[PDB]
Structure formats: C-alpha cells, structure tokens
Amino acid sequence: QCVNLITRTQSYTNSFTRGVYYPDKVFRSSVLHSTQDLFLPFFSNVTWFHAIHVSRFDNPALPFNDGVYFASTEKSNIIRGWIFGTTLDSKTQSLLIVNNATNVVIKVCEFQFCNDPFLDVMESEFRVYSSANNCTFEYVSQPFLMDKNLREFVFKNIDGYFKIYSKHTPINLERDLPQGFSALEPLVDLPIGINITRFQTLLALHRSYLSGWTAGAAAYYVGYLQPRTFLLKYNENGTITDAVDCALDPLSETKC
C-alpha cells in the first residue's frame, strides 16, 4: 500500500547555540566540565525541511551520519516518530519509533519500509511498512511528544546503544531555533546493537472522507553532530545553563 504523497522543500538556517545535551549521567554542581563528544557545533548550518501533502517521489531519505539533531515547532499530532536503519528494507534490521497520545512504541524489526512512509489516522501502520519480519526488539513507555512549543531531540548510535535525548522548550514570535541554552536531558538509552546510516521522519495524515488524505504541512530542522570538545557550566542544582564550543572562535578557545 505504498503511496507517494509528500513533497519536500529545504532551506538553510543557523543552529545558534542549540543542540547541547548532558554528556553523561553524572551529577555535577557549580563546576566547569570539559567533555569531548559528538555535539552540534555552535552557529552551524541546519537544514529546515517543509513537507507538504496536497489533496511522484519527492521525499528522499536523509543520511544519519554520526548522529542527528531534530527540532520541530509543530504540534505533537502532526509528527509521529522516526525511522532508522541502513537499507530500509526487509534484508536488514530497522528501528521504528511511533508515538500516539497514550504512549510511545519503539520497535526494532525487519521492516520493508515504503518510499514515502506516513501514519494515517484508528491508526494504521500499513502505509509505513508493507511487512515486518524477524522482529527482535520492543519497548513501550510514556510518550515524549506531548502538548508555540519547540521540541528538540538528539539521536546518537554509539557502541551498540541508541541514545535519545529530548527537551521541550517554549518559544514566542522569535525564530524557531531560539537563542539561549536549553540542555537536553537524556531520555532513552536502547541496546539496539544495529548499524544506522539513514533516517526519515514520520508524519500523520488524516483521511479526507469526501484527494484521499487531508492536506498538511510539517516543518522540521535537521542538524548533524560532529566530534567536538565543549565546556559546560553546571550551576548549583546540576543544570547546564551555558556552554562554549572550544574550536568555534579564539575567545571560546581561550575560555576552554
């Protein structure tokens, strides 16, 4: 039941200081800690994708690279999860993250994914994949897409563990990648142990019931993590309130 419904346009924006996350689970209070990890560089080039369905294949699969920074200002219902893998077909294992209001289901199976996968609303996953076989992992938990509000995620695939970091930062009229620092709390660490080189975003489409699906638009930001050394400021309560990217400029390098 694979159908091509989504067309995608892309623009370029500034990362500013977004994408900082807690590098470890260690509590640190009132200290400056320098860590070398996969971080999104400050003021880096971030791609803004507009996905439009109006009532051909124009929604290509993005490369995962070394990790992905994801942001969206859209409401929770429109964007429903992500797809991770290498070949995105039956031959290799793949990771599917699907959110619905009650809960989140994270499941790793041999999905034969469609070229333009989308969740259609009861909710059916037939559009997302034709078949799933040899399924080896399932994790069900409270959802992380809940209800203006910018939702930020960081995905890393390090040493056989899929680390997911998230933050929910409210924003006003100001541009969707805001100024300031919102540290991303570690959310879910999964021992998937699979190779991930490509990823795709999942959108939700409503049936028209009158042009099979209702017209929709979704805007999201994708940035790529790079191996970088950061200096993080831990306040009295253990929150990361500030950071400097050491390699970005001489002043920050001196600070580092």
């Binding site: 509590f27 992992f137 056989g160 709390e185 570690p186 142990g193 253990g238």
Partner: protein, 360 residues
C-alpha cells in the same frame, strides 16, 4: 621507620591511620522483568520433536532458580557451563527449545550423539553451550486410547544440521521408482506417531525436554542473572557497590537534589561525592572513611621510653587524650603553663618531657 635502635627526641611521622570497613553493602535495582521461564517449562501443550518449539529470550533477567525447582528432573546435563555459575553469568541471547520424546532417546539430545532424533529431528552442535532438561510427563501426555498428537521424523534423505527444523511432510522415496506423492510400496510417510500409553515401560514413557542454548555476540549482553538487593546501612564505613561502582565510604544523608536521569555525583576534582540509591530513589552523600597521619612524639630513648601518638587531622571522637587543631593527641596531658617549644606539635601546641606534657 628510622632504621635505628635509638631514637632522638622529636616527633616522627611513622604511619597512616585508617578506619577499617565494617560491612559490605551492595545495592542493585529491584528485580523485575524476569524471563518467562514459567511459560516454557509449564505449558498446557508441548510440541512434536520434528516441529520443536523455539522461543528467543532477550532483554530480561534470567531467574534459573524457578527452573531448578519446577519438577524432579531425569537429566539436567549442562554442556560447556557449570549449573551453579549460570546465575552469575550474563549471556546475549537464550534460546529455549521445547519438545516431547520417548525416554530412551533423551540421551540422544547431547553433542556428538546419533539416533533417529539426533539425525532427523533435533541436532545439537559439537561445541554447544547450554543445558538439556528433561522430566517425566505421564499425566500430561499419556492417554489409555493413545496420544497420537506427538510425532517424530523417522525417514529423511540427509541428516539434520544443528539447530535446523524440517516441517515437510513429503513422502520419503527409498526406491528408484518415483513415489508420485501417494503412499505406495517402498514409499513411507516420514512422520510417525508416538503412541504414548500410561502402562509403557520407563524407557518409552513420554518425557518433556527443554534445551537452553546460550549465545554471546558482539552486541551488549542483555540477559543476566538476578541482582541482589541486600540491604542498606548508613553512617558507618562500609564497602559500597552501587550499580557496579565500587569503593569504601560512609553514606550520610544528602541535601542535594538530583535530576531524575542523574545517578552519581562528582567533586570539583572529579572524585565521587554523592550517589542515588537504586532500590529507593534517595540521594546519599558518600564520604570516605577517616584517615590520619600517625606521628609518634618521643623524647630520647635513653632518657625515657614513653611515647605519645598524634593522629593528624582526626577528631578525638573518631579514633590523657587531648584535642588539638593539628589532630588528636593521645598519651600527653595538657598543661595550662606556657614554656618554650621542645617538640613541635603544630597549631601553637608543643610537647615536652618532665610524663609527656603538651602546652601552648
């Protein structure tokens, strides 16, 4: 320390005082999400040996004690691992294979064995790491009319490879002439029925066999034995094992408000100063046990053999006892009178021999 039998008058730093650990405290997260052994070793219906049931086991805690106490076992043979160590071992994947065979053939379910079952129904590799478990099932699987729902493969063209299953019912062709898919002379259907009856001899009574195969792969191992909660003791110097982080320290109450993800805490100098208990979500201030520099204050040996001991940096309540800023001085009596310094104790305190006295 001085490598001499005569000691000149003075204070000599000779040893380091330590508070020995009294108890061992291991705190691990609550046992939960146990592997479903109760659905493998206690099933209403088992499977035929030809169509042997395989359950993959992953992402759970392996409590083998329930397996141990389920029933009296005719064989609990374990190949390549000892039975006791299983709980303390963690494996990447556990495969549970369940089938019913006659008792005589239980011996065939082992590496290096031959028979109808080994060649054509279930085969174990020579290097197999796992255990084979068998128990009598007369009540569950025997009927007086005869239980004809358990089948075995008697005829196959080639021997089975290890961990292989054949579900084909194709007529076995033992003769040059084609069978044509209809049973005929010299053509025999491969699957035969195990006609179990309650009055059969022990060799032929139905036995339920579960084979546990343990495999380790490059992926992180997610099936490991139960973690002991033990108990938590506070306000004393106890060796602590918290989630695989080890040390020796007192665990005092903590005023630090951790964020929910955070589990451990560190100092400015990257030394652990706090921890979150796995069993109960509370924060504890880890403080290492008291240490001191033991210094011996003595006059010349020829004059006297009396000595006094200074514990540097140690309060007197944690070890002629006097408390000084330098530490606790034992064996010297404080005198209000002031004299010139003879043996320096530090912090304005000096010692002299007149017994040994300490003074400002």
């Amino acid at each position: 320390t001085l490598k001499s039998f005569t000691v000149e008058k003075g204070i000599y730093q000779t040893s380091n005082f330590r508070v020995q650990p009294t108890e061992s405290i291991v705190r691990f997260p609550n046992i939960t999400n146990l592997c479903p052994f109760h659905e493998v070793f206690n099933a209403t219906t088992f499977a035929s040996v030809y169509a042997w049931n395989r359950k993959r086991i992953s992402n759970c805690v392996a409590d083998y004690s329930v397996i141990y106490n389920f029933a009296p076992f005719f064989a609990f043979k374990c190949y390549g691992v000892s039975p006791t160590k299983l709980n303390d071992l963690c494996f990447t994947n556990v495969y549970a294979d369940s089938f019913v065979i006659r008792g005589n053939e239980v011996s065939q379910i082992a590496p290096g064995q031959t028979g109808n079952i080994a060649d054509y129904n279930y085969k174990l590799p020579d290097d197999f790491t796992g255990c084979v478990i068998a128990w009598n099932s007369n009540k569950l699987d025997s009927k007086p009319s005869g239980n004809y729902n358990y089948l075995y493969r008697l005829f196959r063209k080639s021997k089975l490879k290890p961990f292989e299953r054949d579900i084909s019912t194709e007529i076995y062709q033992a003769g040059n002439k084609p069978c044509n898919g209809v049973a005929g002379p010299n053509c025999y259907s491969p699957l035969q029925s195990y006609g179990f009856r309650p009055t059969y001899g022990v060799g032929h009574q139905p036995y339920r066999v579960v084979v546990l195969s343990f495999e380790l792969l490059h992926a992180p191992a997610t099936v490991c034995g139960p973690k002991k909660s033990t108990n938590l003791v506070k306000n004393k110097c106890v060796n602590f094992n918290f989630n695989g982080l080890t040390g020796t320290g007192v665990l005092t109450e903590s005023n630090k408000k951790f964020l929910p993800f955070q589990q451990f805490g560190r100092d400015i100098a990257d030394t652990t100063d706090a921890v979150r208990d796995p069993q109960t979500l509370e924060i504890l201030d880890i403080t290492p046990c008291s240490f001191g520099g033991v210094s011996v204050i003595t006059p010349g040996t020829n004059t006297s053999n009396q000595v006094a001991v200074l514990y540097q940096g140690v309060n007197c309540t944690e070890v002629n006892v006097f408390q000084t800023r330098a530490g606790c001085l034992i064996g010297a009596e404080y005198v209000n009178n002031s004299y010139e310094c003879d043996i320096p104790i530090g912090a304005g305190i000096c010692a002299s021999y007149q017994s040994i006295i300490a003074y400002t």
